[PDB]
Scaffold this active site. Structure first.
Site, mmCIF file in Angstrom:
data_model
loop_
_atom_site.group_PDB
_atom_site.id
_atom_site.type_symbol
_atom_site.label_atom_id
_atom_site.label_comp_id
_atom_site.label_asym_id
_atom_site.label_seq_id
_atom_site.Cartn_x
_atom_site.Cartn_y
_atom_site.Cartn_z
ATOM 1 N N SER B 106 -38.053 7.608 33.095
ATOM 2 C CA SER B 106 -39.436 8.034 32.946
ATOM 3 C C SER B 106 -40.232 7.859 34.234
ATOM 4 O O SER B 106 -39.888 7.028 35.075
ATOM 5 C CB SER B 106 -40.107 7.195 31.852
ATOM 6 O OG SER B 106 -41.506 7.437 31.788
ATOM 7 N N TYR B 129 -43.704 13.831 35.832
ATOM 8 C CA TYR B 129 -45.009 14.114 35.247
ATOM 9 C C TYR B 129 -45.761 14.601 36.473
ATOM 10 O O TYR B 129 -45.769 13.925 37.505
ATOM 11 C CB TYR B 129 -45.676 12.853 34.700
ATOM 12 C CG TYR B 129 -45.424 12.621 33.230
ATOM 13 C CD1 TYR B 129 -45.475 13.680 32.321
ATOM 14 C CD2 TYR B 129 -45.126 11.349 32.746
ATOM 15 C CE1 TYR B 129 -45.237 13.475 30.975
ATOM 16 C CE2 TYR B 129 -44.883 11.138 31.393
ATOM 17 C CZ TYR B 129 -44.941 12.204 30.516
ATOM 18 O OH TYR B 129 -44.698 12.018 29.172
ATOM 19 N N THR B 155 -41.585 17.455 32.258
ATOM 20 C CA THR B 155 -42.156 17.385 30.921
ATOM 21 C C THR B 155 -43.386 18.277 30.844
ATOM 22 O O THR B 155 -44.304 18.145 31.653
ATOM 23 C CB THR B 155 -42.514 15.929 30.548
ATOM 24 O OG1 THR B 155 -41.349 15.114 30.707
ATOM 25 C CG2 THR B 155 -42.992 15.824 29.093
ATOM 26 N N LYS B 215 -38.621 20.433 30.036
ATOM 27 C CA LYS B 215 -38.669 19.618 28.834
ATOM 28 C C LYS B 215 -39.899 19.861 27.973
ATOM 29 O O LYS B 215 -41.004 19.506 28.356
ATOM 30 C CB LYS B 215 -38.584 18.141 29.251
ATOM 31 C CG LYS B 215 -38.637 17.123 28.123
ATOM 32 C CD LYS B 215 -38.237 15.742 28.644
ATOM 33 C CE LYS B 215 -38.238 14.675 27.556
ATOM 34 N NZ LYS B 215 -39.611 14.221 27.196
ATOM 35 N N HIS B 239 -41.758 16.288 22.016
ATOM 36 C CA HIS B 239 -42.152 14.967 22.496
ATOM 37 C C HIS B 239 -42.057 13.905 21.403
ATOM 38 O O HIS B 239 -42.918 13.027 21.321
ATOM 39 C CB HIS B 239 -43.576 15.026 23.061
ATOM 40 C CG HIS B 239 -43.794 14.145 24.251
ATOM 41 N ND1 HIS B 239 -43.637 14.592 25.545
ATOM 42 C CD2 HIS B 239 -44.183 12.853 24.350
ATOM 43 C CE1 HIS B 239 -43.925 13.620 26.388
ATOM 44 N NE2 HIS B 239 -44.258 12.551 25.688
HETATM 45 C C1 FMN Z 1 -42.793 5.427 22.795
HETATM 46 C C2 FMN Z 1 -42.330 6.693 23.465
HETATM 47 C C3 FMN Z 1 -42.502 6.858 24.821
HETATM 48 C C4 FMN Z 1 -42.176 8.062 25.405
HETATM 49 N N1 FMN Z 1 -42.334 8.193 26.754
HETATM 50 C C5 FMN Z 1 -41.997 9.380 27.340
HETATM 51 C C6 FMN Z 1 -42.029 9.371 28.779
HETATM 52 O O1 FMN Z 1 -42.230 8.399 29.518
HETATM 53 N N2 FMN Z 1 -41.709 10.624 29.354
HETATM 54 C C7 FMN Z 1 -41.400 11.770 28.644
HETATM 55 O O2 FMN Z 1 -41.217 12.878 29.106
HETATM 56 N N3 FMN Z 1 -41.347 11.615 27.295
HETATM 57 C C8 FMN Z 1 -41.523 10.449 26.581
HETATM 58 N N4 FMN Z 1 -41.290 10.305 25.248
HETATM 59 C C9 FMN Z 1 -40.705 11.285 24.533
HETATM 60 C C10 FMN Z 1 -39.282 11.723 24.885
HETATM 61 O O3 FMN Z 1 -38.542 10.874 25.635
HETATM 62 C C11 FMN Z 1 -38.385 12.237 23.820
HETATM 63 O O4 FMN Z 1 -38.773 13.581 23.573
HETATM 64 C C12 FMN Z 1 -38.048 11.425 22.558
HETATM 65 O O5 FMN Z 1 -38.911 10.409 22.012
HETATM 66 C C13 FMN Z 1 -37.320 12.269 21.496
HETATM 67 O O6 FMN Z 1 -37.413 11.897 20.090
HETATM 68 P P1 FMN Z 1 -36.777 10.658 19.321
HETATM 69 O O7 FMN Z 1 -37.646 9.546 19.800
HETATM 70 O O8 FMN Z 1 -36.954 11.053 17.916
HETATM 71 O O9 FMN Z 1 -35.375 10.588 19.800
HETATM 72 C C14 FMN Z 1 -41.662 9.096 24.649
HETATM 73 C C15 FMN Z 1 -41.486 8.915 23.298
HETATM 74 C C16 FMN Z 1 -41.806 7.736 22.701
HETATM 75 C C17 FMN Z 1 -41.394 7.577 21.255
HETATM 76 C C1 DHP Z 2 -50.149 -0.647 21.898
HETATM 77 C C2 DHP Z 2 -49.090 -0.572 23.049
HETATM 78 C C3 DHP Z 2 -49.714 -0.114 24.379
HETATM 79 C C4 DHP Z 2 -49.250 1.292 24.803
HETATM 80 C C5 DHP Z 2 -48.226 1.268 25.954
HETATM 81 C C6 DHP Z 2 -48.531 2.322 27.037
HETATM 82 C C7 DHP Z 2 -47.451 3.411 27.147
HETATM 83 C C8 DHP Z 2 -47.871 4.567 28.073
HETATM 84 C C9 DHP Z 2 -47.645 5.958 27.447
HETATM 85 C C10 DHP Z 2 -46.151 6.326 27.357
HETATM 86 C C11 DHP Z 2 -45.888 7.692 26.697
HETATM 87 C C12 DHP Z 2 -45.883 7.984 25.343
HETATM 88 O O1 DHP Z 2 -46.157 7.167 24.536
HETATM 89 C C13 DHP Z 2 -45.534 9.244 25.142
HETATM 90 O O2 DHP Z 2 -45.430 9.929 23.976
HETATM 91 N N1 DHP Z 2 -45.286 9.790 26.316
HETATM 92 C C14 DHP Z 2 -45.585 8.875 27.268
HETATM 93 O O3 DHP Z 2 -45.404 9.670 28.487
#
Ligand code: FMN
Ligand code: DHP
Ligand code: FMN
Ligand code: FMN
Ligand code: FMN
Ligand code: DHP
Ligand code: DHP
Ligand code: DHP
Lengths: 344, 344, 344, 344
Positions: B106, B129, B155, B215, B239
């Site tokens: 990420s 990003y 993304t 993505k 996402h």
């Molecule tokens: C808590 C959390 C943080 C995420 N952070 C990112 C991120 O840093 N970058 C990004 O492109 N997507 C992020 N995603 C989404 C993707 O990595 C991804 O599409 C994924 O969560 C797919 O679904 P699944 O969680 O059901 O496997 C995040 C998702 C969650 C649940």
């Molecule tokens: C309550 C816990 C505090 C939250 C933590 C900060 C995380 C920063 C956002 C990360 C992120 C997601 O959560 C997401 O769907 N995509 C992202 O790019």
């Protein structure tokens, strides 16, 4: 405590309004199957978002019957608003003008066209209920033109038939009928003309030059007749699901009516619109705009003019965000391919 | 007590993580309708097993962008993994390399590309990003190339908008932004460029020779544009159902995007993948591989590096058994006719 | 306390009738899946109301087999009505004549054709159960003609196979078999001829000139045979869902049978009709009229003749209102396009 | 207390059997989605009864592989029946012969082919599990021919993988393997040959002249291969939903397999058959007969030989009544048009 969205006003209104009044407001017809459908059907339509689109500047202004407004979300006619809040139609007219949108004034309003028009500048439509005595109808229409109303919405899905167990607050009257020559509870009852037909739409056009919108169409068949008879617009409606149960949700009927009109006149919709996502979905299906009924009375009961303005704002902000997330910068860019209807 | 499958890590993580953190991890958007769908939709697809096939030797190795890996199951980018476990990205990088698969890092990681790359040999992708200041973007991309990252995942379904009620542990920073010239909670907020468009994909290709994967695609329309603009791959994603509610489940959208790409570039999928059967179903529909997001953070919170390795193993063993039972000895033998989709 | 609709009589009847009797009345076959369907299926059909139609004068009178009646709602044959109320068939005959509609007299009635005919002027049909001894059948048919009955309804969906745990009230007998030469509980049991075939319909026509209606048709195949063999009408029926479970709801089967008959003979329906909306829906699908079974016995048990008359009135008023709201002034104006069937 | 139908034996068996044993019997694979489907799917098929047909004489006898039997309901192979009742296979063989139908003997039986054959005259089929050591297979097949078995059912949907927590009663052994040269719990485990292919079906035909039925087909693709490779029949099966979850219900897959075989060889079905209505539905879809598995072990546990005979009788009587009510006098008269499948 805090209202994050429109549907919450309903809980607050329910808390402060007498049971009989709240039930009357929220109620549908019979089993209330369509009441639920008007809402549920919006959730059976999915989004098909587009990516890599510059959504920095969103524009949701539009032109309705030549009038430029700030958003495609308007106010439907709900009778006797002073029963929900003492300000009633005054509050509503002011919130609508402030929001830069249109408000439709009911025939059964507790404020006359001129009382409403006195509130200030704003585009308003007048909702007409045709009584048997055409003389009274003519009086109402001319009076609306004089007061500056821009179009007439002829309601044709008027429900038939609590009343005997309720007593109205003092001084609440159907102001639009005060002055024109014809308790006030009765009389107006068997005054609605059930012999109303398309020939009456033709006659209406001889007494006024104002655009006539036909309110209460849900079939492609009547939509064509609306166009053929010179109506200026169609409002796909089922009277908030209060006329006949088991008719489809207006959002289910919208596309067929839009198709049938063949782009000749604008098609609008009411019934179950509560969220900005609902607005987007209606526009994607072809509607030129939407009207909200119940949210208006619920928020009015809750916070008065402030409640009505909040509803309009919440809907605007939700609609704006939905456009940004779907890849749409203007209403013109919202396409049928931006959603996946239950039958797609 | 014992983890027999991936979804169980969720219960264990829920037990040991602060409510706010767990809720943030598991959450979808709005009503969370799509969150459920991403999972539910996999169960509306049936198997059509073939019999009398020698399934003594199963081979699930594959080539992703030229790189040979042990299985078609990779790690999606989830921000700030050190908040789930102190080891964070270190644990994940090591489990991924050990499993012989790919890990996507990420942009909002708590470990820099070089910290991750220091863990050892392994194929990794970098998730980009795009900030408004292109200067920062260029710095991040070159830095990723230098650190040995094999592809960039751009993304495009970035969700918009707890934060004010939470305090982060000490020393946790967005390491990838340490050193490059631009609390850390803010600033990075309104840094995401919402004017991002296809022309920006073209520009990205001028600053790096690394494959660019798009993505966040769920329509056939954008898939074509991905191919036309030179993207090296597409990741069908929503996402983790956190961007917009009521968009379809990625497994429902997969086939149309695979069709549209016409075999030009590989299509990958994420969102709701938890079982080996889910992997099989995605591959049968045309995906070249799948990414898992949440299971990674949940197992990391639960058992750290050991938890992440276990997830990957459980998924591998389940996927292998599904192939043996369906009559498939290699990924090449998994056909569209090996499943019966809900619309079949 | 107050009966606003037909289904309420069921609760009242349930209160005053012995459990065994009520259960026997309300019961379907096996799992009772079709029993529910006969009712549920009517709710999967939506209305498509037409507007701006003069609905001031509604006309629901019709001609059934040449006989002019006040409404398309008639009484189906239900055996031994005196067990529900001492008046039994007398009450029913009088309510039917008063309402200006038709009553069908069961073969297993507790009142003879002449007892019923003695009540006064009214159009009645006689329901025939064919016994093995043709001699008895001929005696019953001639006796019905003599008593002034206008048509014979030949039941062909007769269920097969409480009885050993119940004792009948004194003097209750199958009056139609008193006088003709053949406890009364038995004997009549294995008297029904299961070898009945179309050749028997041909024979029936040689002993009487009265119209023969075939009761118990649910397929297009048998409908054609009905027409080819000279039946004067068809009654789409599943014996109140008491013959075989998992057959479709009669309202689901109606259209195919109407199509197959090709307008040659009138098609009628029974099974699950309780509301005026149900009547409209059946007519829109092609039925020339409907028969009600259970509501008759439930209201009879509840208020006797007064209950039966109330059922007929409630249904009439509901049917009339449904026509007014749909834009129909006569039965001739009720079209297939006035509803949207589940498969539309 | 009293068993009116087959499914009731399950409750009684559950009462008297150790939890581990009952759970093992009733269990499906994984989520057990298909276990439920094998049953549920039969209820999504409706009847289309024909009337005015002489149903006085019903004939349900049939010819399976040249052998004339009393009804199209046979016994599927369920391993080690002596664990359900000391009589085990002896009880089953005797009930089957008495009922005039066929019994299939499992390879994992607690009684040898000759022990079963000693019970008396009756048509029996032998179910073959192919071990890696072909020498053992040949020994088993010749032994079955010698004992008078009429056909071999080659199981190809054998599930993979309680055992460590259970101890078997004394003297219970896999009798069919006693004498032929190869605790008994193990060894037989990794003896099943997973390299089994169509070439092995060809080889089987060189060691025996007995008809080979392929057990475990659910696709039209493998059905064709069955015909092309000389199989004498196909058994549409999913091993009682114990092999792989989320495969369709055998009754859902039946028609496609029947179509594919093009009347060349008989197609049979097992999985979820409990009622006479289920039998009718399978035959209407093209099956030449059905096999029942679980009801056999449940009734055996409940009342032994008497329980097994009762199951067969109940099913026969229900099937006979279903034919009479549908208008069918022989199996030859049961048509595809006699039902309305969920997809019709
Ligand atoms: C808590 C959390 C943080 C995420 N952070 C990112 C991120 O840093 N970058 C990004 O492109 N997507 C992020 N995603 C989404 C993707 O990595 C991804 O599409 C994924 O969560 C797919 O679904 P699944 O969680 O059901 O496997 C995040 C998702 C969650 C649940
Ligand atoms: C309550 C816990 C505090 C939250 C933590 C900060 C995380 C920063 C956002 C990360 C992120 C997601 O959560 C997401 O769907 N995509 C992202 O790019
Ligand atoms: C309490 C109430 C009063 C209404 N009064 C009128 C009225 O005066 N005139 C009219 O044409 N329609 C009236 N309507 C209906 C419409 O304004 C409108 O179709 C609307 O309620 C749409 O549905 P919604 O309430 O779900 O937004 C009324 C509806 C309700 C709920
Ligand atoms: C208790 C009872 C008795 C019945 N007796 C007869 C009868 O005597 N003759 C006949 O042809 N059908 C009989 N029927 C069935 C039909 O009259 C008729 O199809 C009817 O019940 C239709 O369904 P409904 O009860 O849902 O209106 C009987 C039905 C019930 C419920
Ligand atoms: C406990 C049990 C043991 C079984 N043993 C065998 C066996 O020995 N051989 C075989 O081919 N199949 C076996 N089967 C499966 C088949 O006989 C058969 O497909 C059957 O269970 C069909 O489904 P039903 O149980 O729903 O009738 C077994 C099934 C069960 C439930
Ligand atoms: C119990 C509260 C008393 C009822 C208040 C009287 C409102 C008059 C009817 C208004 C109206 C509706 O309610 C409606 O659906 N259309 C209308 O035109
Ligand atoms: C427990 C109450 C005793 C039962 C009363 C005897 C009624 C005789 C059968 C009448 C009848 C039915 O019930 C039916 O579906 N058709 C008929 O022709
Ligand atoms: C807990 C009870 C102990 C288990 C009894 C051992 C039975 C041996 C397996 C029999 C068998 C099955 O169970 C099956 O689906 N197919 C088979 O061929």
């Amino acid at each position: 405590m805090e209202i994050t969205n429109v549907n919450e006003y309903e809980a607050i209104a329910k808390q402060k309004l007498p049971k009989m009044v709240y039930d009357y407001y929220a109620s549908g017809a019979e089993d209330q199957w369509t009441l639920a459908e008007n809402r549920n059907a919006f959730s059976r339509i999915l989004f098909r978002p587009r990516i890599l689109i510059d959504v920095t500047n969103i524009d949701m202004t539009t032109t309705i019957l030549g009038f430029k407004i700030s958003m495609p979300i308007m106010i439907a006619p709900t009778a006797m608003q002073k029963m929900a809040h003492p300000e009633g139609e005054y509050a509503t007219a002011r919130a609508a003008s402030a929001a830069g949108t249109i408000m439709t004034l009911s025939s059964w309003a507790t404020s006359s066209v001129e009382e409403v028009a006195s509130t200030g500048p704003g585009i308003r439509f007048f909702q007409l209920y045709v009584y048997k005595d055409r003389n009274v109808v003519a009086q109402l229409v001319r009076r609306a033109e004089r007061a500056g109303f821009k179009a007439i919405a002829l309601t044709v899905d008027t429900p038939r038939l609590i009343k005997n167990r309720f007593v109205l607050p003092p001084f609440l009257t159907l102001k639009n009928f005060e002055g024109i020559d014809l308790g006030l509870s009765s009389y107006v009852a068997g005054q609605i003309d059930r012999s109303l037909s398309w020939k009456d739409v033709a006659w209406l056009q001889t007494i006024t030059s104002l655009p006539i919108l036909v309110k209460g169409v849900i079939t492609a068949e009547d939509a064509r007749l609306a166009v053929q008879h010179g109506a200026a617009g169609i409002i796909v409606s089922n009277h908030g699901a209060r006329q006949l149960d088991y008719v489809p949700a207006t959002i289910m009927a919208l596309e067929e009516v839009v198709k049938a009109a063949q782009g000749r006149i604008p098609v609008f919709l009411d019934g179950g619109v509560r969220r900005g996502t609902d607005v987007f979905k209606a526009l994607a299906l072809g509607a030129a705009g939407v009207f909200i009924g119940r949210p208006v009375v619920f928020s009015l009961a809750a916070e008065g003019e402030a409640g009505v303005k909040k509803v309009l704002q919440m809907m605007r902000d939700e609609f704006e965000l939905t456009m940004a997330l779907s890849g749409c910068r203007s209403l013109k860019e919202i396409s049928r391919s931006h959603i996946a209807a239950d039958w797609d």
